[PDB]
Ligand binder design. Structure first.
Ligand code: SF4
Ligand SMILES: [Cl-]
Length: 407
């Protein structure tokens, strides 16, 4: 039985069936924008809440937004980056690589096992949300994890392999049981005569198990990498980080970069560290610093983004050669990123991924910058359950490790 079949079988049990499990779903933004295409419509032609209604009609007990999981990843990865920076300023190495793309993680383990220590220990948004629901939410609702099935809808054909990593288990209890792609889900709806464009607005569930809505605030973060950078930057400097604009790197396909200059906040420990101490296949060059005549030092964070895997191999070679100098690097296996993932609908439109990206968020939400640490649902989870980012409980549920040679 395929994972689609297993999931549908669980949903086929009447809710009052004594062998019926609690079945929940989480949905990626890239799925939400592309699912309209499965009906021959434009990206974003169906609303987030129409999709939530559609999923509920399949028999899902809870319907979650993967963006809640991404708030968790931003919390942990922003903290991890800042921690690595602090340790390096006072003399888990740098540069740091993101860890959300399983295509990258597979290549890392098989082809670059020596780079393992440089990779973020964070789990992906979907795996963080799944770990959370089978632990925190299970406890809150008085439901045994064994009686819980979680499904995720992803634009990606590699997300099941991510979910299947052996140790992503609960206390064979899987944190995330089944991954379904955008097109597979689109097919499920069409086969059941569900037309998403004709559905009423439904509603999301909060993974916290109380209140209404998806448990994510209004607005956009700019994505996990930018938001992790913002978390670190704003704590370091005491000043806001605007939306980033990445620029194409000359002579290297699929690579974009930005340099972020950071002056420590006055009176901060960061200011102290820079002053008090002025003096590995990828050796950190001690970082790119700057100073002024009066002694106001700063560091420039050198950030790169690679799409996709061939292009990433060429970046790594340059990095190892010392020809490319970066402090924080995001590698995505797909040329267009997740909106162009292998589980997405096929279009004759060469610019379909541009249309999908543009429709990801409305102009209203686009104009409002969201910060994960300000989300009351996230605050409550840390305050009452997780403890501190990077802490013992957070590490146990939300972090992971890598296996040289692969799994
Ligand atoms: S970039 Fe592609 S392979 Fe990587 S997580 Fe996104 S959809 Fe999956
Ligand atoms: Cl994810």
């Amino acid at each position: 039985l395929s994972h689609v079949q297993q999931a549908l079988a669980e949903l086929a049990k009447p809710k009052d069936d004594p062998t019926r499990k609690h079945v929940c779903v989480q949905v990626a933004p890239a799925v939400r924008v592309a699912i309209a295409e499965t009906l021959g419509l434009a990206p974003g032609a169906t609303t987030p809440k129409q999709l939530a209604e559609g999923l509920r009609r399949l028999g899902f007990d809870e319907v979650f937004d993967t963006l809640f999981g991404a708030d968790l990843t931003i919390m942990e990865e922003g903290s991890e980056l800042l921690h690595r920076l602090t340790e390096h300023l006072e003399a888990e190495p740098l540069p740091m690589f993101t860890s959300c793309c399983p295509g990258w993680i597979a290549m890392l383990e098989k082809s670059y096992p020596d780079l393992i220590p440089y990779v973020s220990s964070c789990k992906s948004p979907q795996m963080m949300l799944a770990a959370m629901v089978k632990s925190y939410l299970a406890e809150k609702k008085g439901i045994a994890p064994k009686d819980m099935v979680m499904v995720s809808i992803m634009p990606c054909t590699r997300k099941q392999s991510e979910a299947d990593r052996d140790w992503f288990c609960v206390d064979t209890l899987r944190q995330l049981d089944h991954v379904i792609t955008t097109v597979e889900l689109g097919n499920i709806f069409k086969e059941r005569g569900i037309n998403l464009a004709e559905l009423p607005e439904g509603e999301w569930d909060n993974p916290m198990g109380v209140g209404s809505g998806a448990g994510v605030l209004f607005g956009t973060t700019g994505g996990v990498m930018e938001a992790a950078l913002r978390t670190a930057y704003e704590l370091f400097t005491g000043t806001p980080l605007p939306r980033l604009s990445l620029s194409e790197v000359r002579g290297m396909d699929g690579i974009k970069e930005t340099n972020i200059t950071m002056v420590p906040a006055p009176g901060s420990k960061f200011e102290e560290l820079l002053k008090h101490r002025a003096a590995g296949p990828l050796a950190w060059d001690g970082g790119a610093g700057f100073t002024s005549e009066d002694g106001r030092g700063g560091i420039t964070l050198r950030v790169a983004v690679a799409n996709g895997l061939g292009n990433a191999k060429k970046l790594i070679t340059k990095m190892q050669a010392g020809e490319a100098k970066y402090d924080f690097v995001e590698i995505m296996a797909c040329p267009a990123g997740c909106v162009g993932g292998g589980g997405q609908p096929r279009s004759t439109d060469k610019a379909i991924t541009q249309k999908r990206q543009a429709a990801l968020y409305n102009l209203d939400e686009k104009s409002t910058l969201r910060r994960s640490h300000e989300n009351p649902s996230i605050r409550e989870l840390y305050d009452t359950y997780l403890g501190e980012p990077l802490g013992h409980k957070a590490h146990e549920l939300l972090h992971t490790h890598y296996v040289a040679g692969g799994v």
